[PDB]
Design an enzyme around this catalytic site. Structure first.
Site, PDB file in Angstrom:
ATOM      1  N   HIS C  60       0.803  -1.224   0.000  1.00 55.13           N
ATOM      2  CA  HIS C  60       0.000   0.000   0.000  1.00 55.13           C
ATOM      3  C   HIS C  60       0.842   1.282   0.000  1.00 55.13           C
ATOM      4  O   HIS C  60       1.867   1.351   0.699  1.00 55.13           O
ATOM      5  CB  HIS C  60      -0.951  -0.018   1.199  1.00 55.13           C
ATOM      6  CG  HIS C  60      -0.259  -0.012   2.524  1.00 55.13           C
ATOM      7  ND1 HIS C  60       0.295   1.127   3.065  1.00 55.13           N
ATOM      8  CD2 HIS C  60      -0.082  -0.987   3.438  1.00 55.13           C
ATOM      9  CE1 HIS C  60       0.779   0.850   4.259  1.00 55.13           C
ATOM     10  NE2 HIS C  60       0.562  -0.424   4.511  1.00 55.13           N
ATOM     11  N   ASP C 171       6.691   0.788   6.222  1.00 54.27           N
ATOM     12  CA  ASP C 171       5.291   0.414   6.069  1.00 54.27           C
ATOM     13  C   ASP C 171       4.595   1.451   5.172  1.00 54.27           C
ATOM     14  O   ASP C 171       4.391   2.561   5.610  1.00 54.27           O
ATOM     15  CB  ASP C 171       4.633   0.419   7.435  1.00 54.27           C
ATOM     16  CG  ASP C 171       3.761  -0.772   7.651  1.00 54.27           C
ATOM     17  OD1 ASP C 171       3.730  -1.634   6.754  1.00 54.27           O
ATOM     18  OD2 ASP C 171       3.105  -0.860   8.713  1.00 54.27           O
ATOM     19  N   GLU C 203      -4.768   1.854   3.333  1.00 56.59           N
ATOM     20  CA  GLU C 203      -4.725   0.618   4.103  1.00 56.59           C
ATOM     21  C   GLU C 203      -4.695   0.974   5.577  1.00 56.59           C
ATOM     22  O   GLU C 203      -5.400   0.372   6.385  1.00 56.59           O
ATOM     23  CB  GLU C 203      -3.499  -0.228   3.752  1.00 56.59           C
ATOM     24  CG  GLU C 203      -3.323  -1.471   4.633  1.00 56.59           C
ATOM     25  CD  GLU C 203      -2.401  -1.217   5.818  1.00 56.59           C
ATOM     26  OE1 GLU C 203      -2.176  -0.039   6.154  1.00 56.59           O
ATOM     27  OE2 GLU C 203      -1.897  -2.195   6.419  1.00 56.59           O
ATOM     28  N   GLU C 204      -3.881   1.968   5.917  1.00 61.97           N
ATOM     29  CA  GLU C 204      -3.658   2.344   7.311  1.00 61.97           C
ATOM     30  C   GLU C 204      -4.892   2.918   8.010  1.00 61.97           C
ATOM     31  O   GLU C 204      -4.859   3.110   9.227  1.00 61.97           O
ATOM     32  CB  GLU C 204      -2.501   3.345   7.415  1.00 61.97           C
ATOM     33  CG  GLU C 204      -1.172   2.855   6.799  1.00 61.97           C
ATOM     34  CD  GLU C 204      -0.112   2.407   7.823  1.00 61.97           C
ATOM     35  OE1 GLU C 204      -0.495   1.826   8.870  1.00 61.97           O
ATOM     36  OE2 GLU C 204       1.109   2.634   7.573  1.00 61.97           O
ATOM     37  N   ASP C 226       3.008  -6.439   3.749  1.00 63.25           N
ATOM     38  CA  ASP C 226       3.027  -5.239   4.601  1.00 63.25           C
ATOM     39  C   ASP C 226       4.127  -5.570   5.564  1.00 63.25           C
ATOM     40  O   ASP C 226       4.827  -6.536   5.348  1.00 63.25           O
ATOM     41  CB  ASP C 226       1.705  -5.052   5.383  1.00 63.25           C
ATOM     42  CG  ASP C 226       1.599  -3.659   6.103  1.00 63.25           C
ATOM     43  OD1 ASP C 226       1.990  -3.486   7.299  1.00 63.25           O
ATOM     44  OD2 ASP C 226       1.093  -2.727   5.462  1.00 63.25           O
ATOM     45  N   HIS C 305       6.057   1.936  12.722  1.00 61.94           N
ATOM     46  CA  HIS C 305       5.144   3.072  12.824  1.00 61.94           C
ATOM     47  C   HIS C 305       5.771   4.198  13.644  1.00 61.94           C
ATOM     48  O   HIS C 305       5.081   4.899  14.378  1.00 61.94           O
ATOM     49  CB  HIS C 305       3.856   2.647  13.508  1.00 61.94           C
ATOM     50  CG  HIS C 305       2.752   2.312  12.564  1.00 61.94           C
ATOM     51  ND1 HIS C 305       1.466   2.044  12.982  1.00 61.94           N
ATOM     52  CD2 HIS C 305       2.740   2.199  11.217  1.00 61.94           C
ATOM     53  CE1 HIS C 305       0.708   1.779  11.931  1.00 61.94           C
ATOM     54  NE2 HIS C 305       1.456   1.865  10.847  1.00 61.94           N
TER      55      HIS C 305
HETATM   56 CO   LIG Z   1       1.668  -0.905   6.021  1.00 60.64          CO
HETATM   57 CO   LIG Z   2       1.170   0.351   9.255  1.00 61.40          CO
END
Ligand SMILES: [Co+2]
Ligand SMILES: [Co+2]
Ligand SMILES: [Co+2]
Ligand SMILES: [Co+2]
Ligand SMILES: [Co+2]
Ligand SMILES: [Co+2]
Lengths: 330, 330, 330
Positions: C60, C171, C203-204, C226, C305
């Site tokens: 993504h 990510d 996606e997030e 991912d 993240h």
């Molecule tokens: Co991701």
């Molecule tokens: Co993520």
């Protein structure tokens, strides 16, 4: 035959005061070697040889269970605890309500699940619980159970690797076992001083079975074979499968030091891996330092007093193999 | 034959993702009446008759268990939860570690007893626990179990008065049972529209078995037969043994009201004591109001999702007796 | 060329909804091999071969950033979070406010230093913060930024030993990278079934890019590449540099078990060190078990993240080396 011997003896219900079902069965497998007498209070006593009273061995029948104290209006059972359980082990668990008419099963379910949103997320105390037995009302319950009927957990049996065993009631059943295995293996051998095997009552509620023995039995050295709680600093290097343990010191008593040697010696001199320790609580033996050389040796146990008690199957082996090789070579 | 049918199906391990052992056995007792097909994802689907797709019935195989996530250095098993358990039900309890090589038993004993005096007197959280399987080291453990092996509680079976039954896994096994009893009792009768019985997977982790069905199966009315959590205000006058319950409303869905009548009618018109309720959580049926008349009826249960789940044996009787008398008279 | 490829793609701003700047550049480096189409919602879809729809691969574009919700009277920017950040990572950090007119830099400084003696020594919550952009008043701010402009952290790039890489936006950028490297390496090879590479949006914030795909793309097996959050018990023996991981199970989905094998097999059979795991959160793939064999494999990551996300440069190597050797040998 060591397992199924053990499976056979944990399965028998009977907490302090109510040891019948246990000693009747000890007698089923003893009747026809050696000769018993039953105490007033309840104790199975079994002398071997005659003369001055030399050694005494005690493993206790009673266990921790629940006394039924009364009945609710909708026919759930109230209970007190007999002995020392931990409440988190009470919540939502099958039990087995022993009555006069005989066995009867119920469940301390009481498990308000996920969907009630008053979250009782602390441990729920022994007195907020009741047993379900499927009774429709206060009346229908009495049809089945009366006060001072007692109950015990439906006990699973588990053999962990091949080595270990888990089930609730090793304390002190395994011990009751040992002093049987280790009494069939005596008698006909006879070459002795004079040793007394005993199966005590009410140990888990104040040692009262052995406090009763302390009359008529003034021996020379008195042993207890109860559990040895394991795997805490304060347990030193005791670990499971490294052979029986000598309770050097607990909370009820610090025990004869020379007697400790006298066995520790016989131990290594006899090809055994005895180990030594300091734990908590007490043992029937500690009812004798009143006047008597006391010491209690045992098998180290994990998750004690929970339906997950886990003794190593070798230690048990070696422990009878020693609490025999004591009754002679001492 | 209702009991032992039930004892037979709770005993089978298999949590979400891992339902094999369950549906293989459903097929053992279905093979030779009616005809199955197995979903990609896993679902047992079994049509009856041909034509427009009329009713759909779902009871799910999967249950709540533990996924083994990894292994400690001393060969204890780590796990996550699959589904919704309550931690107090994790502490000190036998389990049953299902592997490839097959069943293997262990114990989430972890029960620091009375004598350690740092008293963890709060509930101990699911992630501080590990399973004991008697392994000597990290290596010896892998000899027996690998990650993504799973486990389940050693389940006792209990029949409370004569009426009730307790064991962990009624959700939704009883349902799997019903839709079998209630499929042998069909077929050869044939006089129908066209009804689809299904045995779903992964319900307890998001209904994903039935979310997969929702393709290819656009029926007219879709039912779920799962549990109905019981005995809280918010449960109205639902009590155990007063016949199956209609989940009118839960947390996943408030269900067709006309469909509710349409069964409630068939109910009283057919000599049955259906009752109605509002509980919490959800049901596979609620994967269909997507486009479909949904409703899930069920048997009220006490101590749900604990190894003490307790359904009344009559309701189960009457519920098959109705979820049959639906597949015709609707 | 793996690094600078990576440096190139983390540097591109674009959070959920606002992925433009990312897919325009994917197209800059794809235009002239293979052929694209862009979803309504936004998704880059790129088929390879023709016929039944076999595999689907998704990484993504979108990332976690901040949505500008409004402006203060003294020209500081208010924002909501898009995705999942942790507030302690918001306090006192440069950002990069992306507008229509184009990039514009500011700072979520807000750092009352040592000398104010009301010590806010707890973490300061996402809604007490604002961005400084040097605007003199509410008016002067709008000269530069309007609501629903968004922003992202000034991202440092770091190569730790020689092996690892840190920066905010792995990510799922690394994944976007992989499915490019691993698409140039296809096409002209052609020998196939029919595989679909996709670059997903949003996606997030709920997988909504891939929930949109789930129409028109019913494949046989759908993969997500991912991240795999790393180094917690519950991660088993997953460690960094021991090759790609198979998300067996997360919080969004427990994934096909046979598909797991089918790759695990191809893995060892192809000279690769695939590893397996259980983590948290979810993956675009889990938008397909709706009807589809799902699984998402990935590279284990530390400090996920956060602007410190750290993937091992080999795993990435081996992972394209496998998510290629899948699109054939499956
Ligand atoms: Co991701
Ligand atoms: Co993520
Ligand atoms: Co004891
Ligand atoms: Co005890
Ligand atoms: Co269920
Ligand atoms: Co359930």
């Amino acid at each position: 035959s060591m397992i199924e011997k053990l499976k056979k003896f944990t399965q028998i219900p009977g907490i302090s005061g109510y040891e019948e079902r246990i000693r009747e069965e000890i007698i089923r497998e003893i009747k026809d070697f050696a000769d018993y007498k039953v105490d007033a209070i309840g104790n199975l006593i079994v002398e071997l040889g005659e003369g001055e009273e030399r050694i005494l061995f005690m493993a206790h029948m009673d266990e921790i269970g629940l006394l039924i104290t009364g009945i609710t209006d909708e026919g759930k059972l109230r209970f007190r605890k007999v002995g020392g359980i931990d409440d988190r082990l009470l919540y939502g668990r099958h039990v087995n309500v022993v009555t006069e008419k005989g066995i009867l099963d119920g469940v301390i379910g009481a498990t308000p699940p996920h969907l009630s949103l008053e979250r009782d997320k602390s441990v729920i105390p022994w007195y907020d619980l009741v047993i379900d037995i499927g009774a429709e009302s206060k009346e229908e319950a009495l049809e089945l159970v009366k006060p001072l009927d007692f109950a015990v957990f439906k006990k699973h049996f588990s053999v962990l690797n091949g080595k270990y065993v888990s089930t609730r009631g090793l304390d002190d059943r395994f011990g009751v076992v040992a002093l049987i295995e280790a009494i069939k293996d005596l008698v006909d051998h006879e070459l002795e001083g004079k040793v007394i095997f005993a199966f005590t009552v009410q140990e888990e509620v104040g040692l009262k079975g052995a406090k009763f023995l302390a009359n008529h039995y003034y021996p020379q050295y008195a042993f207890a074979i109860d559990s040895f709680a394991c795997c805490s600093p304060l347990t030193g290097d005791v670990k499971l499968g490294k052979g029986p343990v000598i309770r050097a010191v607990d909370n009820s008593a610090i025990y004869s030091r020379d007697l400790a040697r006298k066995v520790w010696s016989i131990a290594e001199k006899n090809g055994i891996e005895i180990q030594i320790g300091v734990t908590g609580g007490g043992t029937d033996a500690s009812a004798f330092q009143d006047r008597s050389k006391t010491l209690a040796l045992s098998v180290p146990i994990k998750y004690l007093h929970s339906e997950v008690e886990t003794l190593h199957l070798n230690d048990l082996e070696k422990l009878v193999k020693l609490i025999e090789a004591l009754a002679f070579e001492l």
